[model samples]
Target: SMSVKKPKRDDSKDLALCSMILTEMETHEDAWPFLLPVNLKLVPGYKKVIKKPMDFSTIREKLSSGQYPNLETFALDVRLVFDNCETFNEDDSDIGRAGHNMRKYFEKKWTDTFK
Candidate 1:
């Protein structure tokens, strides 16, 4: 009788793939509004509208700090940025449009890379 136990899968490749996705999303022309957290002066009441806010910078920081456990977890933060954007800004507003565009770009890249 033989029993084999496998433990500790390699996740370095997944990390790299996630890093690439963040890089591409950050470089997108529509990435401006998502680059940082919303300014209180610019978007008055921003704190009230969005219960939880997320941004590319935060995502990047988390990525660098090894805060994400997996690729899907990393992707969730990226999506949260857009979700908060859509929730807080008017659909026709400049920032609102940027969020949509950025989300679209990310999704395309995700599908191409993952599926």
Candidate 2:
């Protein structure tokens, strides 16, 4: 039988940060698309393999339901989606600022937890 590996100690903290960032993201219209995967509405038969906009509600529901076991992995997934965004400028757009804020939240959380 295969044994399940336990998640890292920081997973909860990371989830908290994700929640905070996602909540803040709701206010930034430009950053919403960066949160989730693209949904092509025109194709009637096409299914959304990867849904876009990792909004607060989704994150909270998943985290609370224990659907996510690795927040580090989750964080990477979010960053990957953010990187794929083509609408926002790297430094000037609201999307960029929101991303910066997310990183800042993580940095601060890490520093606080580690020290």
Candidate 3:
């Protein structure tokens, strides 16, 4: 009898990390556009802005391919994207709040994971 193939042990860990990364993105959907190009105009109330959401396939593949040198480094790299947002400093705009939340989320995750 043929048996079903089982995933390698690290398969679940890689999937878990990818899920965590995507979950973090979902929490900042409202502020996500700040990471987009300056020319993309997100409508006032449009619930949809991204056609495919952010592509983490490459990163996920990489994560699964081999051991990452440092997850903290990865988290910091992710945070850098949020830190570069022009709207991040607005402090009163929807975009700014979203940026703040994104940064906060990554920072707390980094600290919690590394601490």
Candidate 4:
């Protein structure tokens, strides 16, 4: 959950627990039974300009210029990838954990694909 102390980066902040789940997966073998295997997907979509209205034209313009116009793009990507993973199950925690793992794994390999 976000607070007035700081603006929230994600509406699904509760999903942040995914990091802890990764830690658990690393620490406990028995936790495997509780774990759900997940697949990561990368689907391109619109970027969010949280404070401003967003549309295809705005996104395309920013992308064509190689600029990240807003966090919405990242958030939308997160939502898409997360939804793609959840198509396999309805558990929020599982989805969150799986999404978390995918994000971290993707970050590690992101540039490798471009290179």
* Model 2 CA deviation exceeding 4 Å by range: 1-53, 77-90
> In candidate 3, what residue range of length 10 has the lowest lDDT sum?
45-54
The C-alpha lDDT values of all candidates are: 0.87, 0.54, 0.51, 0.40
| Predicted candidate 2 versus true structure: per-residue lDDT over 1-115, tens digit per residue | 2686776465447666656655655455555544543455853322443344444455556766767776565555455455444223356766677667665655565455444
lDDT of 3 by residue, 1-115 (tens): 2787766444335446644764666556554554344433544322243332222343344456654555644554465555544323467877667667776776776566445
Candidate 4 residues lying further than 4 Å off, grouped into runs, are: 1-67, 90-97, 100-115
TM match of model 2 to true structure: 0.44
TM-score of each model, in listed order: 0.84, 0.44, 0.47, 0.25
Residues forming the 10-long window of minimal summed lDDT in candidate 1: 1-10
> If both were scored by TM-score, which would come out higher, candidate 2 or candidate 4?
2
> What would the per-residue lDDT of candidate 4 be over residues 13-104, giving only the tens digit for each residue?
32333333334333443333223322123323212212233322333344446464344453454344445444434456754475556556
For model 1 the local lDDT of residue 60 reads: 90
Q: What's the ranking of the predictions by TM-score, best on top?
A: 1, 3, 2, 4
Number of backbone collisions per candidate, in order?
0, 6, 0, 3
Ranking by lDDT: 1, 2, 3, 4
lDDT of 1 by residue, 1-115 (tens): 2587678666668888988999988898888888887776777778777888898998999999989988889888899999998887889999889988888889998899877
lDDT assessment of candidate 1: 0.87
Count steric clashes of candidate 3.
0
